[model samples]
Target: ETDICKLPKDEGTCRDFILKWYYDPNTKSCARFWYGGCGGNENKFGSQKECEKVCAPV
Candidate 1:
């Protein structure tokens, strides 16, 4: 479980300044970040609620 959450922070390759959220396994919480708007892994989320619902610490 939480394989996505286990993934490290990713800002993608391109530079577009798209707001995104990612799970911080160390903090066990979602943090705000910027996306490149091109390519990214499943670790990225559209909203904090979406991230926590899927990767929230138990």
Candidate 2:
């Protein structure tokens, strides 16, 4: 099986799909996909604004 990480973002579906498939089940958290690291655990965010605030280019 191919790893979700290897897929191009535009070609693939929402990032949440990958997160839901790979990470959310283990954590039981809501399927929220964001940029930057998930509190240093993973590269996702709880909200798009949070991601923009944290990961957006200066």
Candidate 3:
């Protein structure tokens, strides 16, 4: 496994990390239990901080 701290700070790496840590590619997104907002979709955040807002609460 790759060391997360060594990963490049780019959208691709970030997205991959999000998908791996928070989401499942087989389901095409994160688990429903992690979903947020009125729509209950995991891809709702426009920025990582926005996503963290929800994560921090859970």
Candidate 4:
């Protein structure tokens, strides 16, 4: 929520090959939450570094 990131966007939202990430308020960092394994979007990331690139700016 601190910054916007261009991450993997799930094009299927109902299939596989999709990796997702969300901010964990408990750990104060971005964490891997889901993966559909179909398509990657611009909201979630495929890797930790991808999420950090835009989130780990604090």
Over 1-58, each residue of candidate 4 has an lDDT whose tens digit, in order, gives: 5434433333445555544675444565777766565444455666777776666647
Off by over 4 Å in 1: none
The reply for model 3, stretches above 4 Å from the true place, is 1-42
Estimate, for each residue in 1-58, the C-alpha lDDT of model 1 and write its tens digit.
4697889888887867789999998888999989887778889999999999999876
Those runs of model 4 whose alpha carbons end farther than 4 Å from true positions after fitting are 1-12, 37-42
Candidate 2 regions exceeding 4 Å error are 1-41
List TM-score per model, in order: 0.86, 0.30, 0.23, 0.48
Backbone collision tally, model 4:
15
lDDT ranking, best first:
1, 4, 2, 3
Candidate 3, residues 1-58: lDDT per residue as tens digits? 1122222222232112232223233333323222222322323345545434444333
C-alpha lDDT of residue 50 in model 2: 48
Better of 2 and 3 by lDDT: 2
For model 2, residues 1-58, the per-residue Cα lDDT tens digits are 1132222223133333333112232332223433332222333444645444444343
Cα TM-score of candidate 3: 0.23
Q: Judging by TM-score, tell me the better candidate of 2 and 3.
A: 2
Error of model 3, residue 16, in angstroms: 19
